[PDB]
Amino acid sequence: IETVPVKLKPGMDGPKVKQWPLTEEKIKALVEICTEMEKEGKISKIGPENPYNTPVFAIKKKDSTKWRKLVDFRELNKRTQDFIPHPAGLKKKKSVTVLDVGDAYFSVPLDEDFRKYTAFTIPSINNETPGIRYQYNVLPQGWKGSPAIFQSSMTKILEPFKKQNPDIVIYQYMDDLYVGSDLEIGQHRTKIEELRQHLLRWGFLWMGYELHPDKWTVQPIVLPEKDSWTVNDIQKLVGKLNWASQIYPGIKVRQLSKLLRGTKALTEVIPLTEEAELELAENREILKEPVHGVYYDPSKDLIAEIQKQGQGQWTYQIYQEPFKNLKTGKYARMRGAHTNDVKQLTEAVQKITTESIVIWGKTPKFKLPIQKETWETWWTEYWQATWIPEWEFVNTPPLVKLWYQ
Amino acid sequence: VPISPIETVPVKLKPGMDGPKVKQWPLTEEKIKALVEICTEMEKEGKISKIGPENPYNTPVFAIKKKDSTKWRKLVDFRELNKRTQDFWEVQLGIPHPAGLKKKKSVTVLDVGDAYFSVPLDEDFRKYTAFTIPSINNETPGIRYQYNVLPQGWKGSPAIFQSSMTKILEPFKKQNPDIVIYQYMDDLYVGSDLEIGQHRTKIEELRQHLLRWGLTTPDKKHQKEPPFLWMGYELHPDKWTVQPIVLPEKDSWTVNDIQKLVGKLNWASQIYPGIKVRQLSKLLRGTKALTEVIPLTEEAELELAENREILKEPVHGVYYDPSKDLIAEIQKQGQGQWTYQIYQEPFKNLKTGKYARMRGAHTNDVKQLTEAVQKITTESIVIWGKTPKFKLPIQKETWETWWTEYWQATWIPEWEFVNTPPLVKLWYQLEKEPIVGAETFYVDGAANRETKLGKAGYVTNKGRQKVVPLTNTTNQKTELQAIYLALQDSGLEVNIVTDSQYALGIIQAQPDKSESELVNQIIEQLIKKEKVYLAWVPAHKGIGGNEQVDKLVSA
Ligand SMILES: CC(C)c1c(CC2CCCCC2)n(COCc2ccccc2)c(=O)n(O)c1=O
Ligand SMILES: [Mg+2]
C-alpha cells in the first residue's frame, strides 16, 4: 500500500501530447473499460489544473473478443527516470510463451506526485462533449516504471516455481512475461497453465502466444548458382558483390566485371571464364563467414530497416552501425493481410520488435518503407502488442531491395 | 433555498516564477471615480474583497469608455499574471463542425452571463489577482482588492469555468438522455427531438437545476433566433453554412490582401465546392514585409474567376444521420489540386473540401490521391467517428498494379471507381526483367566541377552511339541527360543501363510530373514507350559499355 519515490529526469516536464482521433467503436470500448476501472479505484477523474496528457486508444487481441486499453506512454517513458542484465540464455531457448501479466500491476498503487504525469483523455466524436480525463492511481500498463517497481514485488511470486524448475528461463518486459522451456509442447501447455494458477493464487491473464527462438529466421547473404549467365545476371551479381564489399573484406569483382567487357545485349549469355569462377567461389566462401567485429552495445539504439519485396514478402535487418548487422530476416507469413500492405507492415513491426525483446531486452527504432501520413492514419487499426516502438520514414527507394532477395 | 458550493480548482503558478508586481498606472480623475463605483458594487456581490498592506502583488486596472454607454467598464491587464499562471488542459482544444450534428426538432440557446462570476477561485491563488485603484490626487493609500471568482481575461478562467459547468450538467444529461447540450463561451445550446411542448418543460427542468447551484438563466424567450451565428458559421434548423463569403474585387492586390484571401477561401472551401488556391497561395512564398503589391499570373486570375462563379449563389450543407452510409467523392482539378464532397444521399453535401499537394521536386497523381484520402479519413474520424466509403477517379486495375508494384507500403480503405474524368492513371511502367530483342543502351554522363562543362551519351549492342557536349551542367544533369538521349533514339522497347544511383532514385519513385524541366522530358519519353527496363551497375568497376561511355564523357 506504500508507494515508491518516482521522479522524472532533470529539467524535463511531464508529457503534453495531443490525443489523436478515435472511431466510435473505440471511444465506446474505452468508456466501458474506464468506467469499470474507475469503480475499482485504478483511475480517477481529473480537472483542468492537470496540463499533462498521454494518448490512449483501444485494440483487439489476436483472439480475445474483448477490447483492451493501450496507453501510448512513449513520451512519459522518455522522461521517466532510469531505474536487469538481460538473460542472454532466453534466445538460445527452444520454446517461449508470452503472457500479459499486466493486471498484476493494478494492485500496487502509484506515487502521488507522479500520478499527474499519467493523465490521458477519452475524446468525444466531433468534440460535442469535453474529453473524459483520468489519471492513474495504480501502476499503468505500458509505463517503463511499472515492471521496475513491481519486480521486487514479482520475484517473490515465482520463486516457488523457479525452485521447482531451474531449467525454465523467465524474462519480464513491460506487461509481458516471456517463459521459456526446452521440451515438448504437451508439457509446455500445462506448465504454462500451471504457471497461471500459481499466479492466480495471488490476484486478460489467460492467453497464450508461442515462439521458437531456436528455429527462427536468421539469414546469410547468397549469390545465385547458375549454369548460363546473361549479361544482366552478371551485372546484378557485380552490384550485389560491390555492396557486400562494404561489409566483408576480401571481396573481388575484377575477374567478373572482366566478362562484361564489351557492349553486349542484356539477355546475351556469357560463358564464365575460370578466373571468374575462382573469384565467384572465393566470394561465396567469404560470405558464409560472419561479419567481423560486430557487437551489441547496450548504450546505443537498435535500428531496424524493412524492405517490401512483393507477394507478401518482407526483408529486414537489425543493426546499430551501418553495415554491422546484428541480425537479418525475411517474412512471408503475414497473417490475414493478403490485400493490405499496411496490415502486413504493422504485423512485421511487431514480430521484429518481439524478436528484439527476446534477444536484447529492448526494442529497436524502425525505418519504415511507407509515407508518414499513411502509416500514422492506420497502424492503430492492426496493432496488437501492448508496447509501442519508435519509428521514422524512408521516402527514397533504397537500392538494397533486391540485394536482400 | 440553499445553493451548493462549486468545488474550487487548485491553481498554482509556474514553478520557479513568482507572482506579478507591475506598477499601477496613473488614471484620470473621472476614471478613478468610475472604478470605485464598480468595485464598491462588485464587493457587495462577493466577487472581490478589500485587502491589507501585506499582499505585495499588483495587476494594473484601466477604465474604457463604452461606445455610447455612459456606464464605464473596468479592465484588468492580467497579461503579466497569465505569463506566470500554470498551464491548463484547455477543454476547448476542439470545437464541433456543423456537418457532424444530428438534426434536432428544437434547439434553444441559454446565455450564462453571470455564471462566469458565480464560480469561486482557489483561495491560495487569490493573492496574485490583487490590484490597486489609485486614489484622488495620490493622497490616500490606493484601495486594494483581490478577486474571489474567475476574473475576465485570466488565463485559466475558460478552463475552470467549462469543467465546472460540465460537472453540473452531467447529472442532468444522465437523468434525461433525450437531450443534448453544448457549451461554448457564455452560451448553452440545448436541443432535442421532443414534442415541442415537452421540450420547454425540460428547458425549465434545466433552468431550475441550474439554480440548484445559484446560476441565473435568461428567463425571456431569447432574442437569438435561427440562424445561430457561431465561430464564423450560420446554423439553421435543417442546414448550415458560413457567414457570407463575398470577394474583394480590386485592381491592385497587396500582400496583406493575399494572405487574408488565403484564410478566407480555405474557410469557404469547406462548403463551397471546387475552390482552388494553388497559383494564388503560390504568390506569398517569399517576403514578410506587409505592404507589397504583386501582379498575379494569367493562371491565378483565370483561377480566381472560376472562384467567383462558385460564390454567386449561397450553398448549404446537410446535418448527419447515423443510420445512412457516409460517402466521400474526390475529383482531380489539375496542378496538384483536388476537391472532395462528403455526403450520405446524392447531391446533399454534408461538407466539402480541397487538398493541395505537398512541396516537392517530383510528384505523382496516385500518391496525391492517396494523400487526399488520408486527409479525408482523418477528418471523418474527427467529425463522424467513422471512415466514409470513397468514390475515386481511378480504376481498380490501375490501383492494383500500383500498390502491388510500388516499393512502399500503401493502402486505401473501402472505395469504388467513379467514372468522372480526368482519371488518375499510370502513364508508364517499368519492366522487371531485361527485354529480349530490345536494343541495350549503356548511358553515362560527366561534368567538370570548375567549368560546368560536361558530356552525355550512350553506346548500344548494335554499335549505335552518341555523345553530346553540354555547358553549365552538373554530374546529376548529365546522368539524366544521357538517359534522355537513350529514350530519344530508341525503338518502342529499350533496355537502359546506367550507373547513376541518383537517376535511378528519381525514376524508381515513378514520377509523372516534375519541377525539373529535364525530368519531365524523360517522363514524356517513357510515355511514348511500350517496354522500358532500367538496370543499374556500379561505376568505375570497368563494366563494359559503362566503361566505354564513361571514358567518352569524362574526356
Ligand atoms: C444542440 C446542438 C448540439 C445542435 C445544434 C447547436 C449548435 C450551435 C452552434 C455550435 C454547435 C452546436 N445545431 C445547430 O442549430 C440548428 C437548429 C436546429 C433546430 C432548431 C433550431 C436550430 C443542430 O443543428 N443540431 O442538430 C444539434 O444537435
Ligand atoms: Mg561515370
Where are chain B's structural domains? 1-91+117-157, 92-116+158-226, 227-320, 321-427, 428-555
Q: Which three cell numbers mark B128?
A: 496574485
Residues 6+ apart with CB under 8 A from B52: B144
Q: Is B441 touching ligand 1 by the criterion CB < 6 Å?
A: no
Is the separation of the CB atoms in B72 and B62 below 8 Å?
no
DSSP A109: B
Q: Range(s) for CATH 3.10.10.10 in chain A? A: 5-88+114-154
Helix or strand run (H / E) with residue B532:
strand B531-536
Q: Which three cell numbers mark B7?
A: 468545488
Find chain A residues with C-beta within 8 A of B163's C-beta.
47-48, 130
Binding residues of A for Mg(2+), as ranges, are: 100, 175-176
Is A92 in a helix, a strand, or coil? coil
Q: Which three cell numbers mark B265?
A: 477561401
Would you say B321 is a known binding-site residue?
no
Strand-by-strand arrangement of the B493-498 sheet: B465-470, B454-460, B439-447, B493-498, B531-536
Pocket test for ligand 1, best of B192, B221, B228 (most atoms within 8 A of CB): B228
What does each C-alpha distance from B127 to A95, B15, B41, B159 come to in angstroms?
Answer: 65, 16, 21, 20
* B408 vs A50, A263, A371: nearest CB: A371
Residues 6+ apart with CB under 8 A from B554: B446, B455
DSSP A357: H
Residue of minimum CA distance from atom 9 in ligand 1:
B230
DSSP B346: T
Alpha-helical regions (H) of B176-244: 196-211
How far apart are alpha carbons A271 and A375 in whole angstroms? 47
Q: Provide the CB-side half-sphere exposure for B403 (13 A, CA).
A: 22
Strand partners, B342: B328, B351
What does each C-alpha distance from B439 to A234, A267, B499, B526 come to in angstroms?
Answer: 18, 10, 18, 15
The DSSP-derived string for A200-215 is HT---TT--EEE-GGG
Put simply, the chain A residues between 244 and 283 with a CB less than 8 A from any chain B CB are 253-254, 257-258, 260-268
How far apart are alpha carbons B520 and B517 in whole angstroms? 6
Return the axis-axis angle of helices B365-384 and B396-405, rounded to nearest 10°. Answer: 100
Question: What value, to the nearest 5°, has the Cα angle with vertex A314 and ends A313 and A317?
Answer: 150
How far apart are alpha carbons B357 and B512 in whole angstroms? 14
| Three-state SS annotation for B375-393 | HHHHHHHHHHCCCCEEEEC
Cited resolution, angstroms: 2.7
- Which ligand number lies closest to the CA of residue B554? 2
List the one residue out of B351, B439, B340 whose CA is nearest residue B391. B340
The CATH number of domain A89-113+155-210 is 3.20.20.390: no
* Chain centroid to CA A105: 22
What does each C-alpha distance from A133 to A14, A55, A125, B164 come to in angstroms?
Answer: 16, 11, 15, 14
Which CATH number is associated with domain A297-405?
3.30.70.270
Q: Which three cell numbers mark B116?
A: 462566469
Residues 6+ apart with CB under 8 A from B529: B428, B487, B492, B493, B494
For residue A358, which amino acid is it? V
* Cell numbers 450553398: residue: B315
Is the separation of the CB atoms in A24 and B382 below 8 Å?
no
List the one residue out of A311, A307, A357, A310 whose CA is nearest residue A329. A307
Pocket test for ligand 1, best of B92, B95, B97, B101 (most atoms within 8 A of CB): B101
Is the separation of the CB atoms in A15 and A54 below 8 Å?
yes
Using CA coordinates, name the residue in chain A closest to B435. A267
List the one residue out of B311, B228, B238, B237 whose CA is nearest residue B274. B311
Is the separation of the CB atoms in A143 and A80 below 8 Å?
yes
How far apart are alpha carbons A389 and A354 in whole angstroms? 10
List the one residue out of B444, B509, B436, B443 whose CA is nearest residue A232. B436
List the one residue out of B155, B152, B231, B148 whose CA is nearest residue B189. B231
Alpha-helical regions (H) of A166-230: 185-200
For residue B224, which amino acid is it? K
Architecture per CATH, domain A211-296, reads as 2-Layer Sandwich (3.30)
Is the separation of the CB atoms in A26 and A131 below 8 Å?
no
List the one residue out of B434, B435, B432, B423 whose CA is nearest residue B405. B432
Q: How far is B124 from chain A (nearest CA, A)?
A: 14
Q: Do the strands A390-393 and A365-368 form a parallel or antiparallel pair, or are they unpaired?
A: parallel
Alpha-helical regions (H) of B278-395: 278-281, 301-308, 365-384
How far apart are alpha carbons A178 and A168 in whole angstroms? 10
Residues 6+ apart with CB under 8 A from B69: none
**Domain B321-427 -> CATH class:** alpha beta
Q: Looking only at Cα atoms, what is the longest distance across chain A?
A: 81
How far apart are alpha carbons A202 and A107 in whole angstroms? 10
Q: Is B322 touching ligand 1 by the criterion CB < 6 Å?
A: no
Q: Range(s) for CATH 3.30.70.270 in chain A? A: 89-113+155-210, 211-296, 297-405
How far apart are alpha carbons B350 and B99 in whole angstroms? 5
Which runs of E-coded beta strand occur in B231-326? 233-235, 240-242
What does each C-alpha distance from A55 to A71, A81, A205, B171, B440 come to in angstroms?
Answer: 6, 20, 24, 27, 55
Architecture per CATH, domain B1-91+117-157, reads as Roll (3.10)
Is A313 in a helix, a strand, or coil? strand
Helix or strand run (H / E) with residue A25:
helix A24-39
* Chain centroid to CA A351: 6
How far apart are alpha carbons A203 and A206 in whole angstroms? 13
How far apart are alpha carbons B164 and B555 in whole angstroms? 80
List the one residue out of B81, B155, B15, B158 whose CA is nearest residue A113. B15
Architecture per CATH, domain B227-320, reads as 2-Layer Sandwich (3.30)
B396 φ, ψ to 5°? Answer: -60, -30
Q: Which three cell numbers mark A142?
A: 505500458
Q: How far is A134 from chain B (nearest CA, A)?
A: 12
Is the separation of the CB atoms in B88 and B150 below 8 Å?
no
Is the separation of the CB atoms in A105 and A142 below 8 Å?
no
Q: Count of CB atoms within 10 A of residue A337's CB?
A: 17
Cα pseudo-dihedral B480, B483, B485, B490, rounded to 10: -160
Question: What value, to the nearest 5°, has the Cα angle with vertex A51 and ends B97 and A377?
Answer: 50
How far apart are alpha carbons B416 and B389 in whole angstroms? 8
Would you say B187 is a known binding-site residue?
yes
Terminal C-alpha separation, chain B: 101
How far apart are alpha carbons B171 and A133 in whole angstroms? 17
B97 φ, ψ to 5°? Answer: -105, 135
Q: Which three cell numbers mark B542?
A: 570497368
The DSSP-derived string for B104-168 is -SEEEEEE-TTTGGGSB--GGGGGGG-EEEPPGGG-SPPEEEEESB--TT-TTHHHHHHHHHHHH
* Cell numbers 469547406: residue: B270
Helix or strand run (H / E) with residue A341:
helix A341-360
Q: Is B237 touching ligand 1 by the criterion CB < 6 Å?
A: yes
Strand-by-strand arrangement of the B187-192 sheet: B106-111, B187-192, B180-184
DSSP B86: P
Chain A and chain B share a number of CB contacts under 8 A equal to: 186
What does each C-alpha distance from B95 to A159, B91, B248, B535 come to in angstroms?
Answer: 54, 10, 29, 54
How far apart are alpha carbons A272 and A233 in whole angstroms? 12
Is B332 in a helix, a strand, or coil? strand
DSSP B98: G
Question: What value, to the nearest 5°, has the Cα angle with vertex A346 and ends A344 and A349?
Answer: 110
Question: What value, to the nearest 5°, has the Cα angle with vertex B282 and ends B277 and B288?
Answer: 120
CATH superfamily name and code, B428-555: Ribonuclease H-like superfamily/Ribonuclease H (3.30.420.10)
Is the separation of the CB atoms in A95 and A30 below 8 Å?
no
Q: Do B440 and A263 touch (CB under 8 A)?
A: yes
Is B429 in a helix, a strand, or coil? coil
How far apart are alpha carbons B240 and B106 in whole angstroms? 15
How far apart are alpha carbons A379 and A374 in whole angstroms? 9
Is the separation of the CB atoms in B499 and B541 below 8 Å?
no
Write down the experimental method used for this entry. Answer: X-ray
Q: From the CA of B473, how far away is ligand 2's center (Å)?
A: 14
Q: Of the CATH numbers 3.30.465.10, 3.40.50.10540, 3.30.420.40, 3.10.10.10, which one belongs to the domain with range A5-88+114-154?
A: 3.10.10.10
How far apart are alpha carbons A353 and A356 in whole angstroms? 5
Q: Of the CATH numbers 3.40.120.10, 2.60.40.10, 3.90.1150.10, 3.30.70.270, which one belongs to the domain with range B92-116+158-226?
A: 3.30.70.270
Q: Give per-residue burial for A3-15: e unless 16+ CB within 10 Å, then b.
A: ebebebeeeeebb
